[PDB]
Design a binder for this molecule. Structure first.
Ligand SMILES: Nc1ncnc2c1ncn2CC(=O)NCCc1ccc(S(N)(=O)=O)cc1
Ligand SMILES: [Zn+2]
Length: 257
């Protein structure tokens, strides 16, 4: 099965998922001088006040905080998007060292980790239909740098002990994802894909310019998670990121100058 090791990592994925070499793969490097300011872009509308978190799961590749997406409770609208996109889950990708871990890069700079808030287009009825559509998903990406602690992240950090290994889950209600956002909603946007198998080309990427800061202690606790299941040889869950892919026939647009 696919993973992030020497023998099953990103350089191998194309053999089972040929779209890995496709025309709109993610992540990409964001070249800040060649992204174009687009004044037609509308401001992002992040409406998370009625968010209903349910559960946190270690799925063997990252951990997901899952939300009730059976009504319009936590939605993303505006920006490049047409329609309403519902929040279904968020997760992170991170490194073994503070100098790496993000999937997107900015002028080839790597951040310590990257947060993905995953949303799907309600006109397609459910998430499984949406991933089959070129405008099915909107993923809001937020860079993490190491510095001061992020208070809104600590509730996540404190439950990781209970989901150390693949397949473990825990109740995770009443979490407010607004605590994970930076001050500014300035962003870059481009059409891309899921960054793990099945690598489907269904995502409008919205990557915020402003990183959030997290503490050394917070990211260290990410790195104590396990890729393996309970009773299997311990392999630390680190460096679960795909590197930058060719931009091909795409232009990255900026909401700001
Ligand atoms: N009908 C279908 N066919 C095939 N698979 C289906 C499916 N229904 C569900 N699934 C699983 C799937 O696709 N899950 C995608 C999970 C995911 C990966 C990466 C990101 S990320 N890193 O891009 O944010 C965000 C989300
Ligand atoms: Zn992701």
């Amino acid at each position: 099965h696919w993973g992030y090791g020497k023998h099953n990592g990103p350089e191998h994925w194309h053999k089972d998922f040929p779209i890995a070499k496709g025309e709109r793969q993610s992540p990409v490097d964001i070249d800040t001088h060649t992204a174009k300011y687009d004044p037609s872009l509308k401001p992002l509308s992040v409406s998370y006040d009625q968010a209903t978190s349910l559960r946190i799961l270690n799925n063997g590749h990252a951990f997901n905080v899952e939300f009730d997406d059976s009504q319009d409770k936590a939605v993303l609208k505006g920006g490049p998007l047409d329609g309403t996109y519902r929040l279904i889950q968020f997760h992170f990708h991170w490194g073994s060292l503070d100098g790496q871990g993000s999937e997107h890069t900015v002028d080839k700079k790597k951040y310590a980790a990257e947060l993905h808030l995953v949303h799907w287009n309600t006109k397609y009825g459910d998430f499984g239909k949406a991933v089959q559509q070129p405008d099915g998903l909107a993923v809001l990406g937020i860079f993490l740098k190491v510095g001061s602690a992020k208070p809104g992240l600590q509730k996540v950090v404190d439950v990781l002990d209970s989901i150390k290994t693949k397949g473990k889950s825990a109740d995770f209600t009443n979490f407010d994802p607004r605590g994970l956002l930076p001050e500014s909603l300035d962003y870059w946007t481009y059409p891309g894909s899921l960054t793990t198998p099945p690598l489907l080309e269904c995502v409008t990427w919205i990557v915020l310019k402003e990183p959030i800061s997290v503490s050394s202690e917070q990211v260290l606790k990410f790195r104590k998670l396990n890729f393996n299941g309970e009773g299997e040889p311990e392999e630390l869950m680190v460096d679960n990121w795909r590197p930058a892919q060719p931009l091909k026939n795409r232009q990255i647009k900026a909401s700001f100058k």
